[PDB]
Design an enzyme around this catalytic site. Structure first.
Site, PDB file in Angstrom:
ATOM      1  N   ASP A  20     -51.924-113.185  -8.331  1.00 31.29           N
ATOM      2  CA  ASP A  20     -50.366-112.976  -8.407  1.00 31.29           C
ATOM      3  C   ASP A  20     -50.270-111.024  -7.647  1.00 31.29           C
ATOM      4  O   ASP A  20     -49.250-110.219  -8.785  1.00 31.29           O
ATOM      5  CB  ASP A  20     -51.540-112.360  -9.915  1.00 31.29           C
ATOM      6  CG  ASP A  20     -50.265-112.396 -10.984  1.00 31.29           C
ATOM      7  OD1 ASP A  20     -49.369-113.263 -10.945  1.00 31.29           O
ATOM      8  OD2 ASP A  20     -49.785-111.832 -12.172  1.00 31.29           O
ATOM      9  N   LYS A  67     -47.206-109.227  -7.108  1.00 28.30           N
ATOM     10  CA  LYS A  67     -45.682-109.466  -7.270  1.00 28.30           C
ATOM     11  C   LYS A  67     -45.256-108.037  -7.223  1.00 28.30           C
ATOM     12  O   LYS A  67     -45.791-107.003  -7.457  1.00 28.30           O
ATOM     13  CB  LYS A  67     -45.530-110.050  -8.229  1.00 28.30           C
ATOM     14  CG  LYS A  67     -46.223-109.650  -9.269  1.00 28.30           C
ATOM     15  CD  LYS A  67     -45.661-110.525 -10.358  1.00 28.30           C
ATOM     16  CE  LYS A  67     -46.622-110.279 -11.971  1.00 28.30           C
ATOM     17  NZ  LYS A  67     -46.686-111.186 -13.133  1.00 28.30           N
ATOM     18  N   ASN A 103     -46.972-105.753 -10.046  1.00 30.81           N
ATOM     19  CA  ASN A 103     -48.864-105.425 -10.188  1.00 30.81           C
ATOM     20  C   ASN A 103     -48.482-104.391  -9.141  1.00 30.81           C
ATOM     21  O   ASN A 103     -49.930-103.864  -9.778  1.00 30.81           O
ATOM     22  CB  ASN A 103     -48.969-106.816 -10.031  1.00 30.81           C
ATOM     23  CG  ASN A 103     -49.323-107.901 -11.175  1.00 30.81           C
ATOM     24  OD1 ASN A 103     -48.663-107.758 -12.790  1.00 30.81           O
ATOM     25  ND2 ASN A 103     -50.244-108.602 -10.869  1.00 30.81           N
ATOM     26  N   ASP A 133     -54.439-105.499 -11.934  1.00 31.56           N
ATOM     27  CA  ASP A 133     -53.973-107.165 -13.006  1.00 31.56           C
ATOM     28  C   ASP A 133     -54.506-108.012 -12.285  1.00 31.56           C
ATOM     29  O   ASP A 133     -54.237-108.772 -10.869  1.00 31.56           O
ATOM     30  CB  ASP A 133     -53.580-107.167 -13.571  1.00 31.56           C
ATOM     31  CG  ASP A 133     -52.969-109.122 -14.333  1.00 31.56           C
ATOM     32  OD1 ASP A 133     -54.296-109.426 -13.780  1.00 31.56           O
ATOM     33  OD2 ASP A 133     -51.749-108.859 -14.967  1.00 31.56           O
ATOM     34  N   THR A 141     -47.599-116.590 -10.462  1.00 35.55           N
ATOM     35  CA  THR A 141     -45.938-116.344 -11.449  1.00 35.55           C
ATOM     36  C   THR A 141     -44.760-116.866 -10.285  1.00 35.55           C
ATOM     37  O   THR A 141     -45.661-117.091  -9.535  1.00 35.55           O
ATOM     38  CB  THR A 141     -45.693-115.174 -11.067  1.00 35.55           C
ATOM     39  OG1 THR A 141     -46.677-114.496 -11.711  1.00 35.55           O
ATOM     40  CG2 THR A 141     -44.254-114.325 -11.732  1.00 35.55           C
TER      41      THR A 141
HETATM   42  C1  L9M Z   1     -46.971-100.313 -16.963  1.00 35.73           C
HETATM   43  C2  L9M Z   1     -47.466-102.059 -16.013  1.00 35.73           C
HETATM   44  C3  L9M Z   1     -47.568-101.718 -15.028  1.00 35.73           C
HETATM   45  C4  L9M Z   1     -47.803-103.345 -14.772  1.00 35.73           C
HETATM   46  C5  L9M Z   1     -47.813-104.054 -15.835  1.00 35.73           C
HETATM   47  C6  L9M Z   1     -48.032-106.055 -15.404  1.00 35.73           C
HETATM   48  C7  L9M Z   1     -49.004-106.633 -14.985  1.00 35.73           C
HETATM   49  N1  L9M Z   1     -49.637-107.951 -14.592  1.00 35.73           N
HETATM   50  C8  L9M Z   1     -50.083-106.267 -16.787  1.00 35.73           C
HETATM   51  N2  L9M Z   1     -51.295-106.584 -16.977  1.00 35.73           N
HETATM   52  C9  L9M Z   1     -52.083-105.198 -16.885  1.00 35.73           C
HETATM   53  N3  L9M Z   1     -52.784-105.038 -16.092  1.00 35.73           N
HETATM   54  N4  L9M Z   1     -53.618-103.771 -15.282  1.00 35.73           N
HETATM   55  C10 L9M Z   1     -52.688-103.437 -15.088  1.00 35.73           C
HETATM   56  C11 L9M Z   1     -52.735-101.078 -14.594  1.00 35.73           C
HETATM   57  C12 L9M Z   1     -53.899-100.792 -14.217  1.00 35.73           C
HETATM   58  C13 L9M Z   1     -54.294 -99.862 -13.884  1.00 35.73           C
HETATM   59  C14 L9M Z   1     -53.063 -98.638 -14.011  1.00 35.73           C
HETATM   60  N5  L9M Z   1     -52.987 -97.281 -13.619  1.00 35.73           N
HETATM   61  N6  L9M Z   1     -52.345 -97.103 -13.455  1.00 35.73           N
HETATM   62  C15 L9M Z   1     -50.715 -98.226 -14.210  1.00 35.73           C
HETATM   63  C16 L9M Z   1     -49.302 -98.338 -14.520  1.00 35.73           C
HETATM   64  C17 L9M Z   1     -51.787 -99.522 -14.363  1.00 35.73           C
HETATM   65  C18 L9M Z   1     -51.593-100.337 -15.212  1.00 35.73           C
HETATM   66  S1  L9M Z   1     -51.351-103.132 -15.909  1.00 35.73           S
HETATM   67  C19 L9M Z   1     -46.877-104.347 -17.378  1.00 35.73           C
HETATM   68  C20 L9M Z   1     -47.355-102.680 -17.409  1.00 35.73           C
END
Ligand code: L9M
EC number: 2.7.11.11
Lengths: 19, 340
Positions: free
Chosen positions: B156, B158, B161, B174, B191
């Site tokens: 995934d 992109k 992420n 993610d 995606t």
């Molecule tokens: C803001 C945001 C970022 C990415 C997305 C798209 C993703 N496919 C959604 N899934 C996700 N899983 N873990 C995510 C994650 C983990 C640790 C982190 N530390 N800091 C940040 C910022 C952050 C984000 S985000 C949506 C909103």
């Protein structure tokens, strides 16, 4: 141009994964 | 420097399997964190900026509603993402600091990346200079060398992420589509714009799909837009499978050559999937100026350093409506998520 086409594609925003 | 790399991955594999076979559980409790602001929302639930009440350290806490995960048929996916996050350790992979669950939700408290989503930065500047794109690409290349050695396929990649940290480096996020597999698998996931031909087509595929995705990423980072796009996914798949690719005129000859080997429909020739593996990539002309060890060590100066007002600053993220984190008086889906 390619850029113009992208700008009008409807897919310039955050793209979700397929479900 | 090759002996060290092989030695490095050896110890890395040893540390990974210990945790993989014996995952950590319930390393904290919700009341230990003060909810500050929502950083992102959607299907994956929501990610909030939180602050440990005693240490004052800030984190990104992913909150998943168990009932929702079941409805979306993502049970295994969620258990797996957490099992992977707690077992891996790499400079460019986001760290899982704590993980726990209650009657209603599942929580993954990870390291917070203040710099924002790469997506935001790219659409803001338009496109990254080849040196800027290369700096990011290098980090991904090493991250995939690490993940692939553990038989983990990401699936995934992109801009959406990839988070940017304070020093301008990347934090991959993610792993809800990641999988540990030696050989082939067949799941249609990912995606649209980043799917390799073999994923779209019914036939099985292997880790080579991450290298194709790398090609799409480099191309988008340097062009400002993906190599295959359209109004609808099915139209995008059509373009991908044909494999006809055009490059902006401002693309250097060596960048186009690299991309031709990554966005390669034929697996017998796609860089990363040949006898010399990742080395075909690290030794390509476009990467001639890349100091791989220095990148790994985070010693290289980032060509772009996002602004940062503080460790709890959220000005590099979008605005979302806040919603109360509700915990049901009754335990939901206990059996389903016993392993979390
Ligand atoms: C803001 C945001 C970022 C990415 C997305 C798209 C993703 N496919 C959604 N899934 C996700 N899983 N873990 C995510 C994650 C983990 C640790 C982190 N530390 N800091 C940040 C910022 C952050 C984000 S985000 C949506 C909103």
């Amino acid at each position: 141009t390619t850029y113009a086409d992208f700008i009008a594609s409807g897919r310039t925003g955050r793209r979700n994964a397929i479900h | 420097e090759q002996e060290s790399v092989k030695e490095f991955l050896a110890k890395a594999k040893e540390d990974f399997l210990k945790k993989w076979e014996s995952p950590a559980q319930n390393t904290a409790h919700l009341d230990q964190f003060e909810r500050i602001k929502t950083l992102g929302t959607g299907s994956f639930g929501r990610v909030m900026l939180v602050k440990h009440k005693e240490t004052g350290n800030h984190y990104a806490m992913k909150i998943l509603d168990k009932q929702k995960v079941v409805k979306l048929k993502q049970i295994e996916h969620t258990l797996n993402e957490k099992r992977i996050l707690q077992a891996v350790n790499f400079p460019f992979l986001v760290k899982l600091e704590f993980s726990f669950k209650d009657n209603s939700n599942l929580y993954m408290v990870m390291e917070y990346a203040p710099g924002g989503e790469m997506f935001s930065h790219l659409r803001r500047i338009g496109r990254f200079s080849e040196p800027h794109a290369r700096f990011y690409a290098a980090q991904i290349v090493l991250t995939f060398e690490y993940l692939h050695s553990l038989d983990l396929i990401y699936r995934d990649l992109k801009p959406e992420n990839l988070m940017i940290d304070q020093q301008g480096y990347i934090k991959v996020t993610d792993f809800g589509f990641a999988k540990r597999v030696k050989g082939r698998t067949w799941t249609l996931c990912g995606t649209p714009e980043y799917l390799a031909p073999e994923i779209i087509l019914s036939k099985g595929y292997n880790k080579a799909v991450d290298w194709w995705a790398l090609g799409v990423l480099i191309y988008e980072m340097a062009a400002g837009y993906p190599p295959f796009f359209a109004d609808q996914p099915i139209q995008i798949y059509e373009k991908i499978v044909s494999g006809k690719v055009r490059f902006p005129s401002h693309f250097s000859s060596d960048l186009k050559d690299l991309l031709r080997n990554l966005l390669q429909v034929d697996l017998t020739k796609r860089f990363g999937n040949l006898k010399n593996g990742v080395n075909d990539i690290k030794n390509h002309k476009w990467f001639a100026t890349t100091d791989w060890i220095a990148i790994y060590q985070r010693k290289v100066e980032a060509p772009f350093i996002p602004k940062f007002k503080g460790p709890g600053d959220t000005s590099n993220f979008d605005d979302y409506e806040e919603e109360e984190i509700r915990v049901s008086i009754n335990e939901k889906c206990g059996k389903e998520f016993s392993e979390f």
